[PDB]
Design a protein around this ligand. Structure first.
Ligand code: NDG
Ligand code: NDG
Ligand code: CA
Ligand code: CA
Ligand code: ZN
Ligand code: ZN
Lengths: 403, 403
């Protein structure tokens, strides 16, 4: 395979999601859907009466469902959140403005998302492809919490004053907006609940948002495949445009990102409706893209596999990463995986490399890491692998409490 | 060896009274488990609770275990519309135990809301290893257990559709439980599919006399309460306990995991000088004394996170013995001594997963007649077997029969 494409669809489940999924199924591929459950409540200002149907269809078809927050942060676009808020924020177009404010409340939206999904589809946890409590992606934000050493933020994703295209708009990644700062804190809060978050490499979007029916200008399949070819092994989260889509400090060349392209797109771009004739014009682009991408040697996978599953029989090199039971591990020593020697909190063969900051067992801590433990912050003074006896409040040779 | 293990469990905190309870436990040199309802943090729980957050912090800083007792103690099912006054409204009627569970999906959701509220008021709470809000739960009103796949049982008369246990004409039929009970059974199953264990109790430290104006004053004295604990030790109390709504009728008497252990239920609010009596002045001394004399009698105190004993390297396990490892219950396949690199897991030959859940799961020893959920469908285990990845119920029409 020349690479692996991860088709990721944001902002469903909506009516438009249904035909998208059928195109995927016909194409013989699985995708990842980052869902906002407010559509299930009928308050998301989309054609969304088939939201539940779409959710079930996504899950019955084997696609992965991940967590895009309950309301896409629309509570931070309006004065008081309610059933008309999506339409209000759509009226103003202030989505990217003050998008994150109180990061605790904003992170709680992701958990509210689990509540609502599990409300409308009480069986959802019986689906192994339901990953709502494991995989997430922040509204507006090309931000990543993949592993302890694969993390980076969208430093100008959202603004305190002006939308990006506007004159005089400033973006200083070194002194990011308050919204960006808050969004970083959300990332951290989620990572401490065990989420990975993933950004994207390429965004399948209207080439022109200024024309009527802008969804019609979704990149045609052939040139889109060119964009994908260009993103492959090219650290495109740093070079992608527009600016609010960049991940400025993305660890170019980080091993898990090799030979992979994450495509972001939006279900709503594939309906015939307020944005254009997206079903008529864009469903065949999706279909053709899948066909010609396969032809060209790409395979398609899902974000539960973006960090590969630990596999019995496979030989691992030290430093290689796996996902095992939702936790990221990094191989300590090269070896071949066998049945009883899975990664764990006590394995000598692996350390826990989750992208989290709370003190955790069997983590290779590095000098300069700051960890949280029983409500305090501690600076790691000497590198070591955490173990139960070496708690930060009792090991001042390893940790120093910060003020 | 100790005479047995006592698990002090305090329900309905965090409130003001919690603080002095915690201090006495601390002076007693013991750790307890608090099953909390976060509505007190919002100040709508109708208790003296301005120090709720102080109490939560103190509980966690003192090393006590925090477990999930749901956000509002199901008060939303005691009133027409849940709101800031519903606690008082329900205290006005005394209908806590009537229609206590209705929509199990919604009631189970209160346990997740509890997580949200706790993590809102104390954003650092996940940095406490003693925070087990997302792992350990107890249903309001209900002596119900989801411990292991072979250690589960319900409070078949815990809650009612009409009358309370003391009202004449009240009838408890375990064989044909109330609707509220059936709903609570579903809540147990929902939480268990989210990874919770739930535990009931063996003895309840409560007013000896609810008919006086200051009922808290009649909390059993230390010596005779110790006698109750003694009586409970190895004698299947959940079946014999009174009142009837506190029974666990089908409790697996003699089940090994329950041997030599006594779980004590009590309530923080019984240790307050206030509307229930002189709880602080009268009951804090009883608590202190009970701790002293229990120890002198050979008992040790432990927390509910250890009720299912944590897996520990170096310990020898026997075939069929249960452990907890990373919040998951496992059951030993053969007698062996535990080694660092051979931990229980989804792929371990030494252990099977024995969580008390019903969703189809890897490496579970299924029995004939077990019913599992998988991708939205229910399957009868026709051929008992240990589940593996290639034997998903949708593809194994000999091992499983679709219902
Ligand atoms: C231009 C456009 O379609 N923007 C949409 C907005 O309509 C929607 O409410 C939001 C949440 O899904 O996502 C995007 O910002
Ligand atoms: C008689 C008594 O004290 N009942 C209490 C009730 O007051 C309280 O609101 C509820 C939830 O905390 O727990 C108990 O049912
Ligand atoms: Ca995880
Ligand atoms: Ca668990
Ligand atoms: Zn989005
Ligand atoms: Zn209670």
């Amino acid at each position: 395979p020349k690479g692996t494409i991860y088709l990721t669809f944001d902002d469903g489940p909506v009516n438009a999601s249904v035909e998208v999924i059928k195109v995927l199924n016909q194409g013989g591929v699985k995708a990842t859907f980052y869902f906002n459950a407010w559509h299930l409540d009928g308050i998301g200002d989309e054609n969304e009466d088939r939201a539940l149907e779409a959710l079930k269809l996504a899950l019955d078809s084997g696609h992965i469902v991940g967590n895009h927050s309950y309301d896409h942060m629309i509570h931070n676009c309006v004065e008081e959140f309610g059933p008309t808020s999506g339409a209000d924020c759509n009226a103003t177009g202030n989505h990217q403005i003050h998008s994150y404010q109180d990061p605790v409340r904003d992170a709680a939206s992701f958990e509210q998302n689990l509540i609502t999904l599990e409300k409308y589809l009480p069986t959802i946890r019986s689906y192994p492809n339901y990953k709502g409590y494991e995989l997430a992606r922040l509204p507006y934000t090309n931000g990543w919490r993949v592993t302890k050493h694969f993390q980076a933020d969208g430093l100008c994703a959202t603004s305190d004053n002006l939308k990006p295209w506007e004159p005089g708009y400033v973006c200083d990644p070194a002194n990011p907006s308050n919204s960006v700062k808050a969004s970083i804190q959300v990332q951290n809060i989620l990572a401490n609940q065990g989420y990975q978050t993933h950004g994207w490499d390429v965004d399948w979007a209207p080439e022109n948002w200024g024309i009527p029916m802008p969804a019609n200008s979704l990149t045609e399949a052939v040139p889109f495949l060119a964009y994908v070819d260009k993103a492959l092994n090219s650290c495109s989260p740093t070079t992608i445009e527009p600016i609010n889509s960049k991940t400025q400090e993305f660890p170019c060349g980080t091993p898990l990102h090799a030979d992979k392209v994450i495509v972001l797109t939006h279900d709503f771009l594939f309906e015939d409706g307020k944005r254009g004739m997206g079903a008529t014009q864009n469903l065949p682009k999706l279909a053709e893209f899948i066909r010609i991408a396969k032809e060209a040697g790409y395979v398609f996978d899902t974000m539960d596999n973006y960090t590969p599953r630990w596999s019995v029989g496979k030989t691992y090199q030290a430093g290689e990463y796996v996902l095992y039971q939702g936790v990221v591990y990094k191989a300590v020593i090269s070896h071949t995986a066998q049945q009883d020697w899975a990664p764990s909190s006590t394995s000598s063969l692996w350390t826990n490399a989750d992208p989290a900051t709370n003190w955790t067992l069997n983590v290779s801590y590095e000098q300069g890491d700051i960890v949280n433990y029983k409500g305090k912050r501690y600076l790691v003074s000497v590198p070591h692998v955490s173990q139960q006896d070496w708690t930060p409040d009792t090991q001042n040779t390893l940790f120093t409490a910060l003020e």
